[PDB]
Amino acid sequence: TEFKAGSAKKGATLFKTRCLQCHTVEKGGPHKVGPNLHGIFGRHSGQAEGYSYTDANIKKNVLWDENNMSEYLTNPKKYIPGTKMAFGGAKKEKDRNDLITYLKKATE
Amino acid sequence: TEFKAGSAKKGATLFKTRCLQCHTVEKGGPHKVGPNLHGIFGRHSGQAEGYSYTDANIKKNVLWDENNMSEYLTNPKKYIPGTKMAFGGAKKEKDRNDLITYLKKATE
Numbered sequence A, B: 001t002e003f004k005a006g007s008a009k010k011g012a013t014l015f016k017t018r019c020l021q022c023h024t025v026e027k028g029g030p031h032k033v034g035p036n037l038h039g040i041f042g043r044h045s046g047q048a049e050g051y052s053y054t055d056a057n058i059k060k061n062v063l064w065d066e067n068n069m070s071e072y073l074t075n076p077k078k079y080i081p082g083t084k085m086a087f088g089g090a091k092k093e094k095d096r097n098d099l100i101t102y103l104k105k106a107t108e
């Protein structure tokens, strides 16, 4: 929509340096600070099982699609006020396109 | 000196998206637009054999060291006026640290 495909390899590294500390993407992957992200796109916010989400996350009932994920990736707390994700944000569209491209591919 | 180690994987991708179009790093790698970069660090500018450099490059007789490479990576034409490298430049220190870290490792 207002999301353009980017570098999958570029995104894989962004993930390692900004997301891996708290999340996993593989199927059969374990939750850590952050919930496992396999099958995220199309799922609504706060539905992974065996993971303890904030009230904030649950109640947004965000349908993850490349578009929304881009909003959220800019500034998680402004997007979902109350959330415990301590990620400052990805101000760069290019950075986000790359990431979501990556996520798009490795979370399926 | 004024160069700090960064992400090798992060740098590998930067290379793919901004350098691979014209250069190779592997030993036994071929020149393309750009010369093969194996063994670059410690070599002086314009000495790869069988590659056609500008007068500009030769005459700088730049000793490649992480430091110099960082200068050059910011703005090649301002650094070596006359050069045919059509790279706008890496204005980001973080981007450059990552790249040189990468280069440092894969050109040896």
Ligand code: HEC
Pocket: A015, A018, A019, A020, A021, A022, A023, A033, A034, A035, A040, A044, A045, A046, A047, A048, A052, A053, A054, A055, A056, A057, A082, A083, A084, A085, A086, A087, A090, A099, A103
């Ligand atoms: C720890 C410092 C984190 C880092 C770095 C990143 N995330 Fe995160 N994430 C974290 C927590 C604690 C939570 C849950 C918040 C809550 O209120 O319960 C999250 C949540 C997400 C989600 C939503 C999950 C869902 O609804 O199933 C997404 C899509 C997500 N995180 C993605 C994500 C990406 C892509 C990151 C890297 C730039 C990233 N997070 C960083 C903790 C941490």
Ligand code: HEC
Pocket: B015, B018, B019, B020, B021, B022, B023, B033, B034, B035, B040, B044, B045, B046, B047, B048, B052, B053, B054, B055, B056, B057, B082, B083, B084, B085, B086, B087, B090, B099, B103
């Ligand atoms: C084609 C569009 C290029 C891209 C993209 C990059 N480089 Fe380049 N490089 C290119 C040329 C044509 C030349 C030679 C210029 C001349 O005057 O003859 C170069 C040269 C270099 C050098 C110096 C080589 C030496 O002295 O042996 C270096 C260190 C170098 N290039 C590195 C480099 C990196 C790290 C790049 C990605 C950010 C990059 N180049 C992009 C052509 C092209």
